Amino acid sequence: FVDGFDSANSRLIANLSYTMCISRISHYIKCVIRDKIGSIVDVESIQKILSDWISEFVTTVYQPTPLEMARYPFRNVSIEVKTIPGKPGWYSCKINVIPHIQFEGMNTTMTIDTRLEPELFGTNN
Amino acid sequence: FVDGFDSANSRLIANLSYTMCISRISHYIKCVIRDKIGSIVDVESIQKILSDWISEFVTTVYQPTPLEMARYPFRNVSIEVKTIPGKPGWYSCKINVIPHIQFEGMNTTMTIDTRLEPELFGTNN
């Protein structure tokens, strides 16, 4: 792709390790929210239960060592649920998760600049 | 009857409890006004004596509890007396009383509208 964002999307989706994690959210929704299937809830209530959970797994700060940080898979999440017309008791969620992007490689160009410290190679001396 | 007023007339006349009350006015006229049978009185004077009495028994406001309100049987009354030709000392009254109409029953249609609060079922959301 040309657009940078689109190009990055496809790079994260191909990555298995994330779809393993995003899958674990499906095992949360269709598993736990089943309990409150009859309870009276709202657009603002489902956004609470579903967010209050995942919130303990999202950070920006990095912890020392890999293990102590891998506790936090995701970086940040949006959860915009909203009721639909017609069906009164039905809803339609739409989450979006940005996982902590892993290292994958890097190029590097070394060079003798001799321009960094001009005090040693400059004209004025 | 077709005419609504006429239909309501016959509904109140059949009602015994009123004819008991309207009867108590007859026991007032042919009983009390007998005192001033020889006194000099007028069309405007008989309308006073007969009205000043019944006036304490006519209201529109409702009192708490049934008993405290049943003190007032009638709602409103007209009293149009008028002298007749020929007989000078004779008159001819014509009162008309509307008693406090009692409860008698009611129908009721319950329904789930779902149109009362469109903020929850409307399209715009």
Side-chain angles (χ1 to χ4, degrees), chain A residues 82-86 88, chain B residues 114 120-123 125:
Chain A
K82 55 184 177 297
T83 180
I84 53 176
Chain B
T114 326
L120 282 68
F121 314 91
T123 307
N125 67 329

Side-chain angles (χ1 to χ4, degrees), chain A residues 4-73:
Chain A
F5 288 80
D6 295 23
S7 185
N9 278 244
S10 299
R11 225 59 163 272
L12 298 179
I13 293 165
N15 182 274
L16 180 55
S17 60
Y18 300 148
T19 64
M20 307 215 74
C21 288
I22 298 180
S23 168
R24 260 271 288 172
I25 303 169
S26 56
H27 281 339
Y28 182 73
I29 294 176
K30 184 165 164 59
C31 174
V32 175
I33 205 174
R34 294 170 52 73
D35 287 272
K36 50 179 94 303
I37 203 81
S39 303
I40 313 309
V41 293
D42 313 78
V43 180
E44 300 182 355
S45 193
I46 297 167
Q47 182 170 349
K48 188 73 160 52
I49 178 58
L50 185 58
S51 184
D52 285 21
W53 172 70
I54 211 168
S55 298
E56 303 180 355
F57 303 138
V58 280
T59 49
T60 58
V61 296
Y62 301 92
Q63 289 63 10
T65 72
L67 211 187
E68 193 64 18
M69 187 237 61
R71 313 290 179 168
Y72 309 90

Side-chain angles (χ1 to χ4, degrees), chain B residues 13 56 61 66 73 89-90 110 116:
Chain B
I13 293 165
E56 300 179 0
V61 296
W90 259 278
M110 319 185 167
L116 217 182

Side-chain angles (χ1 to χ4, degrees), chain A residues 60-106:
Chain A
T60 58
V61 296
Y62 301 92
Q63 289 63 10
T65 72
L67 211 187
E68 193 64 18
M69 187 237 61
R71 313 290 179 168
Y72 309 90
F74 308 113
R75 183 186 298 278
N76 70 320
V77 180
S78 60
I79 305 183
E80 183 179 2
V81 315
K82 55 184 177 297
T83 180
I84 53 176
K87 313 181 183 181
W90 258 278
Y91 302 82
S92 68
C93 161
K94 177 177 63 55
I95 65 182
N96 158 42
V97 300
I98 294 172
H100 268 354
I101 50 175
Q102 297 168 339
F103 186 98
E104 292 181 338
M106 55 129 61

